[PDB]
């Protein structure tokens, strides 16, 4: 989860 986010939002930038 903690990396899910700033994984999951810098891949769909």
């Known amino acids: 989860i ?3 986010i ?3 939002i ?3 930038f």
């Open 2 to 4: 903690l990396g899910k």
């Open 6 to 8: 700033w994984k999951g």
């Open 10 to 12: 810098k891949s769909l």
